[PDB]
Amino acid sequence: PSLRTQPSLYSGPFPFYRRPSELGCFSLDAQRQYHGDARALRYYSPPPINGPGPDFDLRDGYPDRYQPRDEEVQERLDHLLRWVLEHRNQLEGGPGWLAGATVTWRGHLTKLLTTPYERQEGWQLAASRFQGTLYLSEVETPAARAQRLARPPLLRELMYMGYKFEQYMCADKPGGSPDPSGEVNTNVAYCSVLRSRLGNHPLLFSGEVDCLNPQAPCTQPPSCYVELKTSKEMHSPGQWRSFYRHKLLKWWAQSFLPGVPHVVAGFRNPEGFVCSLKTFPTMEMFENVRNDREGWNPSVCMNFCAAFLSFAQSTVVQDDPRLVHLFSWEPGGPVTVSVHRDAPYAFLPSWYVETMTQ
RNA sequence: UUUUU
Ligand SMILES: O=c1ccn([C@@H]2O[C@H](COP(=O)(O)O)[C@@H](OP(=O)(O)O)[C@H]2O)c(=O)[nH]1
Ligand SMILES: [Mg+2]
Numbered sequence: 220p221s222l223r224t225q226p227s228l229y230s231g232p233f234p235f236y237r238r239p240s241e242l243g244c245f246s247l248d249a250q251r252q253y254h255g256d257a258r259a260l261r262y263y264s265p266p267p268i269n270g271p272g273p274d275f276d277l278r279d280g281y282p283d284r285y286q287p288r289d290e291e292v293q294e295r296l297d298h299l300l301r302w303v304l305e306h307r308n309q310l311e312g313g314p315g316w317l318a319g320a321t322v323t324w325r326g327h328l329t330k331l332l333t334t335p336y337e338r339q340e341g342w343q344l345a346a347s348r349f350q351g352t353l354y355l356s357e358v359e360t361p362a363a364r365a366q367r368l369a370r371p372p373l374l375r376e377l378m379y380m381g382y383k384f385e386q387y388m389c390a391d392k393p394g395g396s397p398d399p400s401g402e403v404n405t406n407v408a409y410c411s412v413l414r415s416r417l418g419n420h421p422l423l424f425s426g427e428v429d430c431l432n433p434q435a436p437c438t439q440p441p442s443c444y445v446e447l448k449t450s451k452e453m454h455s456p457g458q459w460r461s462f463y464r465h466k467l468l469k470w471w472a473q474s475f476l477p478g479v480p481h482v483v484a485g486f487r488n489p490e491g492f493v494c495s496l497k498t499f500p501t502m503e504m505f506e507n508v509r510n511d512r513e514g515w516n517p518s519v520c521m522n523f524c525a526a527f528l529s530f531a532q533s534t535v536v537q538d539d540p541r542l543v544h545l546f547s548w549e550p551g552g553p554v555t556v557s558v559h560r561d562a563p564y565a566f567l568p569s570w571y572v573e574t575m576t577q
Numbered sequence: 578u579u580u581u582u
């Protein structure tokens with residue numbers, strides 16, 4: 220019992236994907252404490268129209284003004300579960316809607332979408348059915364853990380630079396001004412909780428959002444959100460082509476799901492400065508590879524994801540929060556399944572299970 | 578968040 224991942228198997232018509240609706244949000248503060256509000260939301264604030272072009276020093280503050288979240292702490296779905304617990308009787312869709320849904324992080328769905336084309340990094344997804352609801356929580360693979368622990372100094376800095384770029388592009392208040400003199404604390408995060416549906420699979424998922432754009436004529440989330448990104452400066456048509464085929468696929472896969480309409484990219488030079496900005500509308504990303512023999516196709520991404528959801532739902536028959544069906548995948552092969560009980564794979568906490576049961 | 582496919 221396995222699931223194949225080749226694009227050729229999923230090249231059919233684009234499947235049904237419900238326009239995402241924001242059900243709520245939550246913020247994690249500097250101490251990684253949960254708050255059921257939008258206190259962590261920042262606002263899009265690009266360089267003044269009449270001022271000089273951007274010249275953001277992404278290395279500024281590294282590492283003295285860097286407070287990185289502890290990656291050894293595996294939160295899994297915990298924060299999202301707290302939101303669900305605090306909103307279980309306020310969910311739309313009618314009675315039993317949650318019972319037929321699949322709950323997970325936007326990032327987990329993004330990895331599913333890119334699976335047909337990914338050739339370097341594999342993954343593992345733990346699944347448990349509890350009160351009908353199917354929960355999907357990613358598991359760091361042994362290899363990914365090793366790669367993380369062996370993270371090169373350069374990669375460590377590049378990760379900081381991505382967060383630093385946000386600091387140069389966001390203000391704490393609408394129409395306010397960015398403040399690059401502060402600390403980059405990655406425990407801080409604003410998450411949107413959304414409702415959608417792929418095929419006949421209702422979805423409830425949360426995703427971290429970079430900022431809200433006040434200037435945007437459309438003020439209703441998620442349409443008012445913006446995704447920020449950094450990438451190396453490119454000069455040759457060849458570099459741009461590679462960017463379209465590989466990087467854009469991941470940018471599209473991340474922003475399409477939550478309904479974030481724009482991705483603003485900061486291109487950094489070898490010295491670590493962002494001296495150029497470009498906006499990539501999510502719904503136009505595919506245009507760059509539509510007639511490309513080596514490009515990606517959104518339909519393949521979504522059809523595979525729908526296929527995996529069907530596969531997971533049919534495989535996880537037993538309603539038991541202590542039972543886990545681990546779905547494993549490595550480039551070059553199909554998605555396989557193994558069954559496990561309790562620690563270490565079980566991920567639904569007793570505080571959630573006991574409350575939902577009572 | 579980021580390097581690469
Ligand atoms: O990128 C891929 C590549 C392969 N597969 C699968 O790996 C299994 C063994 O084929 P092989 O690659 O020759 O080792 C086959 O499924 P099978 O066991 O025959 O149903 C391929 O379809 C897949 O799902 N994605
Ligand atoms: Mg983000």
Ligand SMILES: [Mg+2]
Pocket residue numbers: 429446447448
């Ligand atoms: Mg971003």
